[PDB]
Amino acid sequence: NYYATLLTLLIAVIVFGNVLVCMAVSREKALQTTTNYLIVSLAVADLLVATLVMPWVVYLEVVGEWKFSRIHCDIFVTLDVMMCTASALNLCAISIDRYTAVAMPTRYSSKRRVTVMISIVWVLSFTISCPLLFGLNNADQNECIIANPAFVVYSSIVSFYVPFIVTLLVYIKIYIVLRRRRKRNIFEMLRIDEGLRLKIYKDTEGYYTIGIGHLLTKSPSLNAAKSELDKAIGRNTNGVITKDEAEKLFNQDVDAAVRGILRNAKLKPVYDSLDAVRRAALINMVFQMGETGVAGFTNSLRMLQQKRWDEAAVNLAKSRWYNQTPNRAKRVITTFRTGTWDAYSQQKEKKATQMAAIVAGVFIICWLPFFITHILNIHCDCNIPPVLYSAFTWLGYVNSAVNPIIYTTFNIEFRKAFLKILH
């Protein structure tokens, strides 16, 4: 047949791509991390799908019927559920290892942590699929387990929806931490450049300000400038505030600065194109020069928009801004060029955390239409086009071959590693 050939071709792609993932991590220094060890554990889960499950699936297409015995069927379904649950439980362990790398501060303590995580993945996958060999410990005596009306509920909830929610809660907790970091990094970036003042003072235009460039009022009365300060800090500040109280005010000024940047037709385009780190450098400039002045760097802003980080740095050093405050300018131009916090303190893990979430998302993209279909079989009893049911099942098995394709795109170390193995 034609569809059986494609399935066998898929088996080759699954094996070819995932054998690469194993050898690459096994032989490349910069690829020998905790996450990458859980990645090869993920590659083994997919390697076993190609070898212990797909032969049953390609057989299932040539024959056109489930012409196994009842024990062969139970074995196949048990292995199919297990090797796919290991993929889900591996993506869960990957997120958790991604949480500890971001949220927590050893070459020996970490390796022991990976060994425990991997063992839990495969022992749990076994214990979850082991009931399927024995009638799901339910009432289905003389029939295969996939004929059990409770199999769909079991493998959906236990093997998929519960790993789905837990992993989703971890990544949400991960995003929240990274967003607190960006709000903290920008505060430090400007208390180094602009300066943190805890008592009321006058800016260069005569207005009473406090914190990091926060005009209390444009009124000349000092007593009135204190009224607006206490109405915003909540307490009788008496002129002095905490560095924490000033950090709350700074975040308000930053958010306000973004509402205007996006409402500025000359700054909104480049602002979208910018990485989050380079986006803080643009906020630094509007904090110093205002949105009016930054919009005058048209030749430079287009180069940031065109990813020309080299030239955008060379042009910005030819401005009257670089000549007026050169120390701060060189620090911000460095941030526009490198895209990190080297000038001020940059986490090198974010790139790996973004790839881990992309793999988890592609996973959900591939299997969710399959489990959405199950919900429809139960809801309306409408018999679904078997070509569609067969498609969403194959799409889920296809997921076993997409992960190595993602490592070549989003990871320079994985991409250059594979090309060295093929040469």
Ligand X SMILES: CCCCCCCC/C=C\CCCCCCCC(=O)O
SS3 36: helix
Cβ nearer to ligand X, comparing 12 with 176:
176
Active site residue 140: no
Partner in contact with 154, chosen from ligand 8NU, ligand X, none, beta carbon below 5 to 8 Å by kind: none
Interface size with ligand 8NU, residues (CB under 6 A) = 15
**Which of 250, 297, 336, 367 is in the footprint of ligand 8NU by CB under 6 A?**
367
Residue 76, Cβ density class (10 Å: 0-12 exposed, 13-18 middle, ≥19 buried): buried
Q: How far is the CB of 139 from ligand 8NU (least distance, A)?
A: 21
Residue 419, Cβ density class (10 Å: 0-12 exposed, 13-18 middle, ≥19 buried): exposed
With b meaning 16 or more CB within 10 Å and e meaning fewer, what string describes 320-334? Answer: ebbeeeeebbebbbb
Sheet holding 214-217, edge to edge: 197-202, 208-211, 214-217
Q: How far is the CB of 403 from ligand 8NU (least distance, A)?
A: 14
Question: Residue 81, interface with ligand 8NU (CB under 6 A)?
Answer: yes
CA 327/CA 385 separation, integer angstroms: 67
Q: Which of residues 84-143 bind ligand 8NU (CB under 6 A)?
A: 84-85, 87-88
Partner in contact with 170, chosen from ligand 8NU, ligand X, none, beta carbon below 5 to 8 Å by kind: ligand X
Q: Which span (77-85, 165-173, 249-257, 283-291) binds ligand 8NU, by CB under 6 A? A: 77-85
Give the residues lining the site for ligand X (CB under 6 A): 88, 91, 96, 99-100, 113, 163-164, 166-171, 173, 357, 360-361, 363-364
Active site residue 205: no
Cβ nearer to ligand X, comparing 152 with 258:
152
Q: How far is the CB of 111 from ligand X (least distance, A)?
A: 11
118: closest CA among 172, 44, 48?
44
Partner in contact with 333, chosen from ligand X, ligand 8NU, none, beta carbon below 5 to 8 Å by kind: none
Residue 224 CB neighbours (<10 A):
14
Q: Which of residues 147-186 bind ligand 8NU (CB under 6 A)?
A: 155, 159-160
Q: Which span (136-144, 195-203, 266-274, 388-396) binds ligand 8NU, by CB under 6 A? A: 388-396
300: closest CA among 328, 337, 331, 263?
337
Q: How far is the CB of 222 from ligand X (least distance, A)?
A: 49
Return all residues near 381 (Cβ < 8 A) that are at least 6 apart. none
Task: Kindly report the backbone phi and psi dihedral angles of residue 210, in degrees, each rounded to the nearest multiple of 5, phi listed first.
Answer: -160, 165
Residue 340 CB neighbours (<10 A):
17
HSE-CB of 382 using CA atoms within 13 angstroms: 9
Return all residues near 327 (Cβ < 8 A) that are at least 6 apart. none
Partner in contact with 396, chosen from ligand 8NU, ligand X, none, beta carbon below 5 to 8 Å by kind: ligand 8NU
Cβ nearer to ligand 8NU, comparing 85 with 185:
85
Return all residues near 378 (Cβ < 8 A) that are at least 6 apart. 152
97: closest CA among 109, 112, 114, 85?
114
Partner in contact with 57, chosen from ligand 8NU, ligand X, none, beta carbon below 5 to 8 Å by kind: ligand 8NU
Partner in contact with 100, chosen from ligand 8NU, ligand X, none, beta carbon below 5 to 8 Å by kind: ligand X
Partner in contact with 367, chosen from ligand 8NU, ligand X, none, beta carbon below 5 to 8 Å by kind: ligand 8NU
Whether 408 contacts 416, CB under 8 Å = no
Structure tokens at 123: 């022992």
Cβ nearer to ligand 8NU, comparing 129 with 411:
129
The residue annotated as part of the active site, out of 61, 194, 230, 275, is 194
Instruction: Considering only CA atoms, give the Rg of the chain.
Output: 28
Partner in contact with 390, chosen from ligand 8NU, ligand X, none, beta carbon below 5 to 8 Å by kind: ligand 8NU
Q: How far is the CB of 86 from ligand 8NU (least distance, A)?
A: 9
Q: How far is the CB of 208 from ligand X (least distance, A)?
A: 45
Structure tokens at 359: 């793999």
HSE-CB of 195 using CA atoms within 13 angstroms: 7
Cβ nearer to ligand X, comparing 36 with 87:
87
Task: Give the catalytic positions in this structure.
Answer: 194, 203
Binding site for ligand 8NU (CB under 6 A): 57, 80-81, 84-85, 87-88, 155, 159-160, 367, 389-390, 393, 396
